[PDB]
Amino acid sequence: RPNRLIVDEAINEDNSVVSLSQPKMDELQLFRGDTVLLKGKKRREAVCIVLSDDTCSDEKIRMNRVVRNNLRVRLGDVISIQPCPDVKYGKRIHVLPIDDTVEGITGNLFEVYLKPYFLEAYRPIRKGDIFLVHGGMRAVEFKVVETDPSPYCIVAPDTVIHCEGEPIKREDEEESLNEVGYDDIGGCRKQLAQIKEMVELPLRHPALFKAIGVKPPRGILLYGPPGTGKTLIARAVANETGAFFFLINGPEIMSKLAGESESNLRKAFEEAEKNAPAIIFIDELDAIAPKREKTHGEVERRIVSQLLTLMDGLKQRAHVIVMAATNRPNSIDPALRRFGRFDREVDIGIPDATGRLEILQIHTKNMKLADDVDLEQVANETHGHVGADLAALCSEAALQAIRKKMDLIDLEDETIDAEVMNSLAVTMDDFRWALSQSNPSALRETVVEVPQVTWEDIGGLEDVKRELQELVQYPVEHPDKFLKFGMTPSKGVLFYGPPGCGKTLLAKAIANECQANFISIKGPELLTMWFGESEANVREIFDKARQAAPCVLFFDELDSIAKARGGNIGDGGGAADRVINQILTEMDGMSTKKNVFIIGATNRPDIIDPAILRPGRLDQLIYIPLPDEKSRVAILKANLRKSPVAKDVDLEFLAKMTNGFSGADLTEICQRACKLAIRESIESEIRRERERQTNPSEDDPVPEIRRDHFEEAMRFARRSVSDNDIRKYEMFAQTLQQSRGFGSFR
Amino acid sequence: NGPEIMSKLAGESESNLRKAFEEAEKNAPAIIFIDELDAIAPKREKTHGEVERRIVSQLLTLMDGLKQRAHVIVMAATNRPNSIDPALRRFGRFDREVDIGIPDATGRLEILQIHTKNMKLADDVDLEQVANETHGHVGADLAALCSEAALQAIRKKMDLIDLEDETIDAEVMNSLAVTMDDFRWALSQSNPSALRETVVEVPQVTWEDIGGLEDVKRELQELVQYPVEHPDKFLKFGMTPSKGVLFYGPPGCGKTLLAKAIANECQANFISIKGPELLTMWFGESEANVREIFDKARQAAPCVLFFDELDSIAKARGGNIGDGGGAADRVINQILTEMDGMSTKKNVFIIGATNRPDIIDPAILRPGRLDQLIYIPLPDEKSRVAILKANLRKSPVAKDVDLEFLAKMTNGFSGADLTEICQRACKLAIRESIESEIRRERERQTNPSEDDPVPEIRRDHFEEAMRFARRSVSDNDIRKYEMFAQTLQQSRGFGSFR
Ligand SMILES: C[C@@H]1CN(C(=O)Cn2ncc(-c3cc(F)c(OCc4nnc(SC5CCCCC5)n4-c4cccnc4)cc3F)n2)C[C@H](C)O1
Ligand SMILES: C[C@@H]1CN(C(=O)Cn2ncc(-c3cc(F)c(OCc4nnc(SC5CCCCC5)n4-c4cccnc4)cc3F)n2)C[C@H](C)O1
């Protein structure tokens, strides 16, 4: 029945598009772009435009917040559709801006923020419709008051659109619920989806939770580095679901009189309870409830008990949800970590490489960014920047664009608003500055991310690409077989081989394949823990992996702790040590987590204590050898990929001449070749500038890495592994290997 | 519950607690339960002042102020009461301190059964795989997993549940039928609350699982089951039963398995403090934590406190030679000191395990302490056959394989590496099965559009696994154990004159 469908989040938006599935649109009687005539809840309909994408699943209908708020529909609701593929034009379309969105910007809004949207964008034009256009550095929205066709009309230059007048006030009877929502959350889509599936039912469906019986999460402990969006995601999941959001940020209450602040918190909870669907969000819970024994006295504990008696005092039949924001909740009171008060503790974490792109896209919506800017180089370069840093970079670029145009902006008495605001056009040249003049907030936190190094990048090693794909992808794709033969899947793999041979690359590729997070604790971090007499910090790292999705917790450069103290011989102590022992102890806990696939990497395995390479722990040894001829050819081609290269070079000859070079030093050879090529190119460029400046007053002296550049780089090459070192790895492999081919009798 | 009172005005919270006790007393059979007693009465010297101690004294004067003729019982809840005020640990106030502990493997099954009563669980779900997989989950985690599975079942049926104005209650609630596919998700999306606490449990590895070693199955059944079944004889001949046994032998030869089987036989708790835990205590300069572990065994029922991989502390610092220090160290010395206290507990049967005994300080292997040495040798021919059959049990196996030939070819492989051979065979068999399954899927997808290419671990899989086998003990290492055994052994058969 195509009449009714359940709404869902849209990704294409365009301020107008409603996304269906063609195998479903055929039932909906729409093919390419036919009008939808979307039917709302109370007393309104929208024309909308039909389109499709991947996430439809032939089950759900997707609408951006413009349509959802226009139709008085919250995400997760059920709505109706009245398909009508017909074309009808209007002549008296009149629109007025919304004072809530225009309260200090004055100009020709019919021309400054309207021209690029009233044609070819297919606005949901219909009397009473409200639409956002996202103009000059502000999410300006308008309402079309009169549309003489209805409920559908052609959005085309044939239809006549008239000029507006003075701004009108927003309808306080409904408030339009603009605020924020899911569409302006980026870089934490998985965490936002987890929160949605965790909190949507109790807030949208409080009626069933009085009958269904099963207790939903009374409180959700959002946490992450400051400025990660905890407040933003909380407010989005509040407004998007229609739940009343009560912010009781810690300092606002801790600053009040002792005893009176307790009353303030209690009456905040009472305010949340008086209306069923409300949610109360406790920002900066570290201040409110830090470690109990680390508090001084009076308020710092008077609140905590007062909080606890209210945190679990609620019966959960009032439909009140207590979300909280903290930083690595190891700091908050352990008493709050109990169940019935905070039973779910999603980790937002810093945005990853491709999440910062989305954050920039959403924040750089109204800036009217120039065409030469890409926002993908900026996202990649902003490594460690938290979403707050991305917003700060956005604002800094905007301010510099204003400040590089203050000469022609202050012509009249300072700013007159006016169309001039569109001229800014923040080019890359301003982003570069903002990025270089902003300090990452969270640069010293283990970043959980899905690495974007695919199987193709790691050429050469092939038996290990299939001997490693097995352990990871077989017990997930067909777990039924593994529970039949009785074997427990091996949640442990350590790569031992010559230094710099793709261990990190192989682990990252494994993470990439099964869309899995990749937490690399490099050797220097383990040395920091060992030297610092803080091996307990290891407990956090493993926990950081546990709270995440399927995670290849990768101990890069393992055995560095032992390598830093001679090893099994040459030192008074034995093989075991602080950090390795703590890793061993905590690993056995994550031997039953069935999502984490602990990986190790070692450049010198024989010093590793054998206590870890036994069943349950990193039992499965894998040997990656130094690349062979064909493998070296593959590595050369793969690591020179994404860089210009001439047809003259034949990588087969280089590979065979590359007799005994590992992956790291082979990529070093490629980097030296590229370095010499860029030096030649820049020298030719400055020489061409010299010619330009002199009397005479062919533009590509070296448009790719030339062959003799590779010649010179190879002449400048260097190898890091000797015959004895490479033989040592195979000799060690003989320890857990055998040549018992004699027992051929089955 | 503590916070409900600690949140009230100082002096007025004292009155609230006092009137709570008065309410308990006004009716004789009432009992008062103090939840989160850590907040109410933490360590006295670690409190700051005012309420945190004003309550405690106010509690103490009421905890023992009751005459016990009013029939009021004051139960309390705490976490490892080493944290609560020691003054409350005195007698006449808290004289019995039972330890609930986390549910064991078979207890989580019952917890799931009771919590999954009203969910109307589907038929394909078993609740025993879920219980086994939920290792470390506390009962609260089991309830959370229950609720998460229920919520996912609702959420995978919200499409046909919100047909009317949201939920109309109605019969539809029976349709949920939370299948395993939802439990799997809930289990994978829940973090164990208590995963770093020594778990007291009755292990479910019976005598049958540990094949081969037989003289030790009867030389170990003796010390454990004779002084409990017929204690009258032991108090007649005068000998005190030996509450100590250390297993020394090649690494990975069933020491942990033998200790677990001993625990299983006499329905006894089994606290294994593996070598890495003792190294954590030694490195951390926190040998006092050992005092807790022994206490954790004392408060439990008959308990084989098992020091798995003992001597790891000495193995981590060279040993008796190669290091400036002597045989003794922090953790081993603390274990020795605390063990003498539990030499008169007559329920605990401290067990040790060592892969390299000669480095162990001999201070522990003398009367009262782990005096009785037991040698488990590397398995022999028949013993290797038994081990093969026992560790391939509970897994499909073909009739083609004849384990006698594998065992004899398995000339010098220990128990651990022999089970490793079996695991490699099963790994290759599962790889072959999954490869055949994906190939069959390929055939299904292509034009043509016999369902058991490999329904058991086949024989050539064992062939290849044995070709991929590996041994962890050499001739010198195995001879070292018997040479050490000669230290406390003799060949004095000359004195045949009675
Ligand atoms: C008592 C015991 C058990 N026993 C049994 O008879 C029952 N039994 N037989 C098999 C299983 C089983 C266990 C699992 F833990 C499991 O996990 C799947 C999984 N899900 N997500 C990931 S993440 C993966 C890697 C990183 C992120 C990207 C993708 N993995 C994953 C991947 C790789 C390795 N390990 C887990 C699946 C299973 F089938 N239980 C008897 C035996 C003698 O002893
Ligand atoms: C002064 C002294 C004594 N003396 C005497 O003449 C008097 N005397 N003679 C014998 C005993 C005696 C002592 C015990 F401690 C005891 O304990 C029984 C027990 N109960 N539960 C378990 S747990 C068991 C193991 C783990 C959990 C699963 C089941 N065990 C147990 C098991 C194995 C080993 N040890 C205890 C029984 C006794 F008979 N007293 C003179 C002498 C020279 O010196």
Ligand SMILES: Nc1ncnc2c1ncn2[C@@H]1O[C@H](COP(=O)(O)OP(=O)(O)O)[C@@H](O)[C@H]1O
């Ligand atoms: N994931 C995100 N998506 C979009 N904006 C974000 C995100 N995280 C942070 N921000 C930006 O950082 C600012 C602070 O947001 P938030 O972290 O929710 O509050 P707080 O910094 O007080 O915790 C907001 O103005 C918001 O625009």
Ligand SMILES: Nc1ncnc2c1ncn2[C@@H]1O[C@H](COP(=O)(O)OP(=O)(O)O)[C@@H](O)[C@H]1O
């Ligand atoms: N196909 C490949 N095989 C091996 N190494 C590669 C390949 N492609 C690139 N590399 C280079 O190998 C390096 C990874 O080194 P890695 O082996 O992780 O060091 P370690 O062995 O110390 O962990 C990267 O710097 C990368 O440039």
Ligand SMILES: Nc1ncnc2c1ncn2[C@@H]1O[C@H](COP(=O)(O)OP(=O)(O)O)[C@@H](O)[C@H]1O
């Ligand atoms: N009958 C048996 N005898 C010996 N070992 C067995 C037997 N059955 C299984 N095993 C294997 O022995 C291993 C136990 O090793 P264990 O001897 O406890 O190591 P350690 O000697 O270091 O304590 C288990 O992993 C198990 O798979």
